[PDB]
């Protein structure tokens, strides 16, 4: 009576694990080569279906992480290698001693000062201390003027060059220098080869969205209760392409996110305590970073004919520094409240027992905030900021860190260990002129880790890759499989 029959054109689907297409608006270099133009169609349809969503185990997020990394690698691959520069450089000894790369016992310093010296210093747009780059507590950038002998395309001829390094980028040989001209090498050369990131990478914004290939679609969880892991999402929305993603890399705070809403969301890994906290856009949180001074850039041709960009500054500018604006105190109070009320949190309900904290250890990769300003990476020391935003009673944090300020001192580093799991070191060319960047702050990347009903520690994290799981995350990629079977009586002849 009842035959299997075949129903073609069926409204049904299954999990897909395939590559997606990228589409963009910036087609000056990368976009034309790899992407389709952005169609501009961001519409979606709602479906009366229930579906399972996860952000840390998806195909949409795991392509964003791998694709951003891979497009970086194919951009630097053909650039000048700096192994010809891994030679002893002759560096000014005073500056190597002052910044601590080398040692001296002839400085016999002794300081007497007031210990009850903690200050509170606030800055805003209408202030001369910002315009003049001289906020209370800022010092000089730390740069070691070094000379070296380099050979160009003429082979049997060479010239001496003037290069000024940030201290962060030098090693410096120590012991029995009773004169001047210390002997220094680049910080990451000897275990590896440093390649220059020459094709304007990080000098502009990279934004793109993903599109499903024919026969495939993206489902999205459009709930407000979505917390990264949700086995049964009742509001499922279907579309062919994702929202536009900002492929920005930083630690501690994420900047310029697309998921900027008038709400605080916290995504938690289902099998872990790692979270991404979005921040409420209501408070207009913003970070404004500055690189004081006016840089000169001098191209150097090295042997193979490829060019290295040197930095012969021959001057002593103030430290790069960052200014935090917007209602940070209130945005942070909401983060604490959002954690207290969250479904996965069973800790303290006392918001005065929940605190922001730096990750521990002496490792700069986690203890400093790392941010990108148009091509130069900055590493910020944030104790002044954290003490301020939490209105912390400093009291015993050593004189220098006992201040409450809405700005932090920072330093420039040119030899960068990149963000993916590679261990690759690249050199970031200096930017000519002065730099300023004004970014929005959209997320706080942190682990929440408590062991009792008192002290919760929101520990700032350096796992920059997870930022992509806030940008996407709520997407699922599915395959439409429109052939069904079902018993019915309608047999042919």
């Amino acid at each position, epitope marked *: 009576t009842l035959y299997v029959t075949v129903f073609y054109g069926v409204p049904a689907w299954r999990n897909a694990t395939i590559p997606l297409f990228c589409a963009t608006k910036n087609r000056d270099t990368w976009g034309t080569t790899q992407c389709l133009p952005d169609n501009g169609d961001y519409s979606e349809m709602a479906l009366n279906v*229930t579906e399972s969503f996860d952000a840390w185990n998806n195909t949409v997020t795991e392509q964003a992480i791998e694709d951003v990394w891979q497009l970086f690698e194919t951009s630097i691959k053909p650039c000048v290698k700096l192994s010809p520069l891994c030679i002893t450089m002759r560096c000014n000894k005073s500056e190597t001693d002052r910044w601590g790369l080398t040692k001296s016992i002839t400085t016999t310093a002794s300081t007497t000062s007031t210990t009850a010296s903690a200050k509170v210093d606030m800055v805003n747009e209408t202030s001369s201390c910002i315009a003049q780059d001289n906020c209370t507590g800022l010092e000089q950038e730390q740069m070691i003027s070094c000379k070296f002998n380099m050979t160009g395309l003429k082979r049997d001829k060479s010239k001496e060059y003037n290069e000024t390094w940030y201290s962060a980028d030098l090693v410096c040989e120590q012991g029995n220098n009773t004169g001047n001209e210390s002997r220094c090498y680049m910080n990451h050369c000897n275990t590896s080869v440093i390649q220059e990131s020459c094709d304007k990478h990080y000098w502009d914004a990279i934004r793109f969205r993903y599109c499903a290939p024919p026969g495939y679609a993206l489902l999205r969880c459009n*709930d407000t*209760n*979505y*917390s990264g*892991f*949700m*086995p*049964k999402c*009742s509001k499922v929305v279907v579309s062919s392409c994702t929202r536009m993603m900002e492929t920005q890399t930083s630690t501690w705070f994420g900047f310029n996110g697309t998921r900027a809403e008038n709400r605080t969301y916290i995504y938690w890994h*289902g099998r872990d305590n790692r979270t991404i906290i979005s921040l409420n856009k209501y408070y207009n949180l913003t970070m404004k970073c500055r690189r004081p001074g006016n840089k000169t850039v001098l191209p150097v041709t090295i042997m193979s004919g490829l060019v290295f960009h040197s930095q012969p500054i021959n001057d002593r500018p103030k430290q790069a520094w960052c200014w935090f604006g917007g209602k940070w105190k209130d945005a942070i109070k909401e983060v604490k409240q959002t954690i*207290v*009320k969250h*479904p*996965r*949190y*069973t800790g303290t*309900n006392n918001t005065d027992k929940i605190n922001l904290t730096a990750p521990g250890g002496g490792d700069p990769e986690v203890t400093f905030m790392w941010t990108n300003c148009r091509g130069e990476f900055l590493y910020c020391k944030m104790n002044w900021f954290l003490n301020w935003v939490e209105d912390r009673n400093t009291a015993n944090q050593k004189p220098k860190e006992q201040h409450k300020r809405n700005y932090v001192p920072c330093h420039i580093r040119q030899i960068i260990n990149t963000w993916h799991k590679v261990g690759k070191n690249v050199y970031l060319p200096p930017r000519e002129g002065d730099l300023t960047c004004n970014s929005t702050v959209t997320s706080l990347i942190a682990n929440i880790d408590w062991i009792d009903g008192n002290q919760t520690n929101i520990t700032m994290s350096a796992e920059v890759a997870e930022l992509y799981r806030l940008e996407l995350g709520d997407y699922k990629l599915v395959e439409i499989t429109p052939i069904g079977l079902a018993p019915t009586s309608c047999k042919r002849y």
Partner: antibody, heavy 132, light 106 residues
């Protein structure tokens, strides 16, 4: 803890109201739902609806989609039912409960199907008769 | 919705015996099923929650487990005080409750 209250006798085609007071707690406490179930004499337990939900969102048993309304009042530490178009089949013991979530690594959202949820705390129950 | 049924509808045993109730569903419940104990004249109380957790305040003689479409409540030693109607609740979606079963005392 949960004390319900209302008229023992209501008539067909009238609207029933039942108000439950919360003692030793409030109606704005985090992550709780204020719910009601019914037990017609001789029958099992029927869930009818849910509102602390910290929000103005509700969930109702679809069979009463156009008949049941639930609200809360923080100045009284009370929550209540309004059930319209009463009939004989609405005779039941009406009960309150908290439907507390088990917060922790098994709770993702305060939604059915996405968090352990249970009625740990129950009220006394009010028997309401619909008659002429 | 999910149809939750219970069996036996009427069962008994002597005080000190092992007595069990089985709940079944037309659809799988991932694990989201509770058990309640109701005595005459009283509101039901939570006995077990989320398949495998005993509710605090409930005696250790009560236990249970389950998944999918089959769940079990066990009283390891029936007490004279356990005469009650027991109920299953699925809360996988808009909770509907099962019909309940009765445990009598011998």
């Amino acid at each position: 803890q949960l004390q319900e209250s209302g008229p023992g006798v209501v008539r067909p085609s009238q609207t029933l109201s039942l108000t439950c007071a919360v003692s030793g707690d409030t109606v704005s406490s985090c992550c709780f739902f204020w719910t009601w179930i019914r037990q017609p004499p001789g029958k099992g337990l029927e869930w009818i609806g849910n509102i602390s939900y910290d929000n103005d969102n509700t969930n109702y048993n679809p069979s009463l989609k156009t008949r049941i309304s639930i609200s809360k009042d923080m100045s009284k530490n009370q929550f209540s039912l309004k059930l319209n178009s009463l009939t004989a089949t609405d005779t039941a013991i009406y009960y309150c409960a908290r439907e507390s979530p088990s917060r922790g690594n098994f709770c993702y959202a305060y939604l059915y199907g996405n968090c352990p949820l249970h009625f740990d705390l129950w009220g006394q129950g009010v028997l309401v008769t619909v008659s002429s | 919705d999910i149809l939750l049924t219970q069996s036996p509808s009427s069962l008994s045993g002597s005080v000190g015996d092992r007595v069990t109730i089985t709940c079944r569903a037309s659809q799988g419940i991932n694990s989201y099923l509770n058990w309640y104990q109701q005595k005459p004249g009283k509101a039901p109380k939570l006995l077990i929650y989320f398949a495998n957790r005993l509710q605090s305040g409930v005696p250790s003689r009560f236990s249970g487990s389950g998944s999918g479409t089959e769940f079990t409540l066990t009283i390891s030693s029936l007490q004279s005080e356990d005469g009650a109607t027991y109920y299953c609740q699925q809360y996988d979606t808009f909770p509907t409750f099962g019909p309940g079963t009765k445990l009598d005392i011998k």
